[PDB]
């Protein structure tokens, strides 16, 4: 009788059961062991290398594993592959579509990912023998704006498009090996775990669903946020991850806890977050807010360790090097401030 | 090495800088345009009436040596709270609204809330909107046929009359111009409600005449960069 309402109430009681199971293992929080370790203080990082080569607003960026070559996306149709050590542009990829929203550096440095409102993930070859940069694979199977994507290897990547579905692509042939379905809202950002076996993607439903690359199914669902999760980054330990949504709060979820542990909230900041990254140790949560300033949130002390000056427009892209050497912050002013 | 790969990387950076300076000329020369509507609001006719131009994703037209980048969004999803933020450096937001769709659904109020969200946005607040009241050829007979009235989905029509500063079309019922301009002022009521001075609505009655609609975009985009530069020098 009333299979629609029956399944709705079954989902409701399952949600209550999951919430009760979360609260059962939530006898304490991350803010209750704050009297056991020393704080970090207000450390103000400075712009070490300034990257001014973009024409339109910089919407996406990604660091390389060498922590030297960083790529960045902008609405001008250019994918500038910077060199953070010498402040040089290694490549300027002419993009097919002007508006692009995603950027992903290959773990080997040979490939790069792009895409946006075109619903097409344009993979470009970096170390190719053809001289300039050309397209390597045209991953066109999404029906929404490709918000963010990450590079597992030079063979398969995962993209979070605006069609409420993520998908593990394949650079070899160009088809979705497995589609990550389950997001009720358009997915805005995904993050790869250091183990690269599973990933979590933050969508516009305040639910950063944890997926598994191997089985292609949704592992967990983290419904602790309140607005569109535009940023996400997996804790360097691999069992946790932070999220940046439009509700002006960041939350550090844990895969082994299936709930939020830390709430990076501050009444002085009311703008949303679209840039989240962790340091080498995960203590500093680089969170790029929409007030033109990035707050270096302490993942264990519930406070920012000093906001980031410089950028005068919304920072929609931010990443920390694989060794935590520096963090390149790119905002909507066509600039990339690399902090250290 | 010391100056083998360092100087070579610097030369590559210089070549990339030259290419980027060459592309910045055309980037600032062309004006990106956001073409969107409330769903089957006649935007297909605007894509047709724009340089007669990978389907409906982006069209480029050039008038008086001024190229434009009219980006259509007829292939995205319904939720438009994130991809519309990518149009923050866009020059104009051409809102193609079916002016005769106030009942068929109440697409005007759907477009009003779309216009109000575009107008009062956090990123689209510094960008004007070229209001294209499309489907006007159907509005020329929609109010007289009785199949679609204004009062059933807009009670402010009884308290509204044709403005004195209006330019009615020769050969139209004053009830049509009263209804056509009510839709214009309905979008303008929420447009001028911002009061920021950084962006102003450009209401045009589209699909009524088959003239060059990009010429209307050209004259609007000309005043867009005018008032943007006027606001830059505190002259407006």
């Amino acid at each position, epitope marked *: 009788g009333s299979e629609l309402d029956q399944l709705r109430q079954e989902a409701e009681q399952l949600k209550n059961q999951i919430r009760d199971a979360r609260k059962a293992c939530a006898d304490a929080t991350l803010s209750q062991i704050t009297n056991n370790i020393d704080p970090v203080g207000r450390i103000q990082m400075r712009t070490r290398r300034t990257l001014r080569g973009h024409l339109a607003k910089i919407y996406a960026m990604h660091w390389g594993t060498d922590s030297r070559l960083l790529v960045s996306a902008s609405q001008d149709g250019k994918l500038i592959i910077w060199d953070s050590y010498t402040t040089n542009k290694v490549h300027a990829i002419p993009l097919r579509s002007s508006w692009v929203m995603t950027c992903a550096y290959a773990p080997s440095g040979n490939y790069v990912a792009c895409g946006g409102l075109d619903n097409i993930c344009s993979i470009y070859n970096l170390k190719t023998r053809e001289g300039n940069v050309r397209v390597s694979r045209e991953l066109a199977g999404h029906t929404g704006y490709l918000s963010c994507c990450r590079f597992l290897d030079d063979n398969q990547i995962v993209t979070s498009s605006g069609d409420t579905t993520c998908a593990l692509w394949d650079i070899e042939t160009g088809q979705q090996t497995t589609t990550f379905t389950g997001h009720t809202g358009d997915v805005m950002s995904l993050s790869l775990a250091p183990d690269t076996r599973l990933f979590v993607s933050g969508a*516009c439903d305040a639910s950063a669903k944890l997926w598994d690359v191997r089985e292609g199914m949704c592992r967990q669902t983290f419904t602790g946020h309140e*607005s*569109d999760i535009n940023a996400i980054c997996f804790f360097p330990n691999g069992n946790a991850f932070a999220t940046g949504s439009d*509700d002006a709060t960041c939350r550090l979820f844990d895969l082994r806890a299936d709930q939020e542990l830390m709430t990076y909230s501050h009444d002085n900041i009311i703008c*949303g977050i679209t840039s989240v990254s962790f340091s080498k140790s995960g203590r500093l949560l680089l969170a790029g807010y929409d007030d033109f300033n990035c707050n270096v949130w302490d993942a264990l002390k519930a406070d920012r360790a000093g906001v980031l000056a410089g950028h005068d427009n919304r920072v929609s892209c931010l990443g920390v090097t694989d060794d935590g050497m520096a963090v390149a912050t790119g905002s909507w002013d066509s600039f990339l401030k690399i902090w250290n | 090495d010391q100056r083998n790969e360092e100087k070579a990387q610097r030369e590559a950076n210089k070549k990339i800088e030259k290419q980027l300076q060459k592309d910045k000329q055309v980037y600032r020369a062309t004006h990106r345009l956001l073409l969107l509507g409330a769903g089957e609001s006649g935007k297909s006719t605007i894509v047709k009436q724009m340089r007669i131009l990978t389907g409906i994703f982006e069209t480029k037209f050039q008038v008086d040596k001024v190229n434009f980048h009219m980006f259509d969004v007829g292939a995205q999803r319904d939720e438009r709270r994130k991809w519309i933020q990518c149009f923050n450096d866009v020059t104009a937001i051409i809102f193609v609204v079916a002016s005769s769709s106030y009942n068929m659904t109440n697409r005007l109020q759907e477009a009003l809330n779309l216009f109000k969200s575009i107008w009062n*946005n956090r990123w689209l607040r510094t960008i004007s909107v070229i209001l294209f009241l499309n489907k006007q050829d159907l509005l020329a007979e929609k109010v007289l046929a009785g199949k679609s009235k204004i009062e059933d989905y807009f*009670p402010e029509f009884a308290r509204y009359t044709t403005p004195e500063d209006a330019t009615p079309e020769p050969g139209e019922d004053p009830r049509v111009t009263r209804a056509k301009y009510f839709i214009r002022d309905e979008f303008l009521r929420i447009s001028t409600a911002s009061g920021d001075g950084r962006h102003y609505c450009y209401p045009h009655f589209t699909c009524s005449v088959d003239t060059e609609n990009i010429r209307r975009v050209f004259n609007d985009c000309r005043d867009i960069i005018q008032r943007m530069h006027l606001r830059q020098y505190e002259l407006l």
Partner: nanobody
Amino acid sequence: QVQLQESGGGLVQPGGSLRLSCAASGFTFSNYKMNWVRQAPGKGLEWVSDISQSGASISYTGSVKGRFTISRDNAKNTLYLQMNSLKPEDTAVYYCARCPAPFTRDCFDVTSTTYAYRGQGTQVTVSS
């Protein structure tokens, strides 16, 4: 978690009164521009009313302008839509769609189905 349950509704006579109680839990209800949308059988999701974060910017659609009445309760975290002088065309499942970005006067919750911060939907229908 964002979750919106609207109590009330049902089958009433055209021209009477009706009031929906939208339970807004899981977010700062006093910081989001909460609004009301409906979806008539055979029609898409149409915006009905809207109210600011504190209760100043109150707006309604033309079909309900003067008839309905929205009122937010920031103390109880509840959004109300006092429906008065009902019409035969008010037969729709009213949703409690919420604006996603807080502290903003803009949002796109009038879009099609599968909206995140939207109520579950109460079938508010009338006779004739």
